[PDB]
């Protein structure tokens, strides 16, 4: 941090990439015991909160220089209620919460479409068009979420001709949320893609607007710009 703090307070904008800020707090508990401290919840250091407060705000942009930081946050045992990442949440302007479920679904990045947030989602920030679609997606993703217990018990047979549609869209939207990461290829073999914001916004529009309700799911899996889906679509037959 002190490194980046240099270029910010001594001179320009800085990108601070901290990989697993968790390991900081984690190592913390390792010492907290030997310090002769009273263990807190879960056996974490009774100072866990403050120790992170004194190392976060430091990672911030000022009137002198700007700091755009992206920190990896490990989730111990997939428990977001764990003091480490929990306490971390109130330290970010934007979050991306990764789920193991979505991961095994094959949805990558496995990013919770209803958990991940940003202070940016405002019409007063991202514009109306981008906003409404934003929630529109989330809306229909949630509506699908609720339906899941029925599907898991009664299949889709007793769902309305209206809820079914929501099951298709939702899925295909939850699939289009998958992406080709350039730092992937060597494994899967697929090249990769950077989808412009205007093209993401648009792509989902059409999907919510139902130009694609004919194309099968699998077509929308692992792609870039919405056009590609149509391409990979025909390739299916």
């Amino acid at each position: 941090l002190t490194m980046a703090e240099y270029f910010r307070d001594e001179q320009q904008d800085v990108l601070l990439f901290i990989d697993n800020i968790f390991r900081f707090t984690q190592a913390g508990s390792e010492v907290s015991a030997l310090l002769g401290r009273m263990p807190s919840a879960v056996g974490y250091q009774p100072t866990l909160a403050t120790e992170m407060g004194q190392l976060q705000e430091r990672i911030t942009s000022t009137a002198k220089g700007s700091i755009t930081s992206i920190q990896a946050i490990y989730v111990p045992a997939d428990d977001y209620t764990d003091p480490a990442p929990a306490t971390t949440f109130s330290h970010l302007d934007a979050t991306t919460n990764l789920e193991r479920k979505l991961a095994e679904m094959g949805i990558y990045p496995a990013v919770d479409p209803l958990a991940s947030t940003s202070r940016a989602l405002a019409p007063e920030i991202v514009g109306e068009e981008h906003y409404q679609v934003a929630r529109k997606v989330q809306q229909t993703l949630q509506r699908y979420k609720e339906l899941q217990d029925i599907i898991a018990i009664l299949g889709m047979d007793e769902l309305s001709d209206e809820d079914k549609l929501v099951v298709h869209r939702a899925r295909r939207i939850q699939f289009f949320l998958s992406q080709n990461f350039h730092v992937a290829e060597q494994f899967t073999g697929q090249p990769g893609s950077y989808v412009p914001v205007k093209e993401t916004v648009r792509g989902f529009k059409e999907i919510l607007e139902g130009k694609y309700d004919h194309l099968p799911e699998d077509a929308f899996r692992l792609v870039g710009r919405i056009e590609e889906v149509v391409e990979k679509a025909k390739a299916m037959g």
Binding site: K101, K145, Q148, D149, I153
Partner: protein
């Protein structure tokens, strides 16, 4: 009427050992009519069932799974 040398078959859409009068088989076609509509219970149990099935599912028998 199926008339066979050894047997007589009477096909009937509706037949009830009834008196001279016909304006009975109608009587039976009556007291049986609405008393078959009165079979709403058929409908209404299934309601109460489709009900229970959506009240045990109300607690969203899975909250984000778990």
């Amino acid at each position: 009427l199926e008339v066979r040398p050894d047997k007589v078959t009477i096909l009937a859409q509706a037949a009830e050992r009834a008196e001279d009068i016909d304006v009975l088989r109608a009587k039976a076609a009556k007291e049986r009519a609405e008393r078959r509509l009165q079979s709403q219970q058929d409908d209404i149990d299934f309601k109460r069932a489709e009900l229970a099935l959506k009240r045990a599912m109300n607690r969203l028998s899975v909250a984000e799974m778990k």
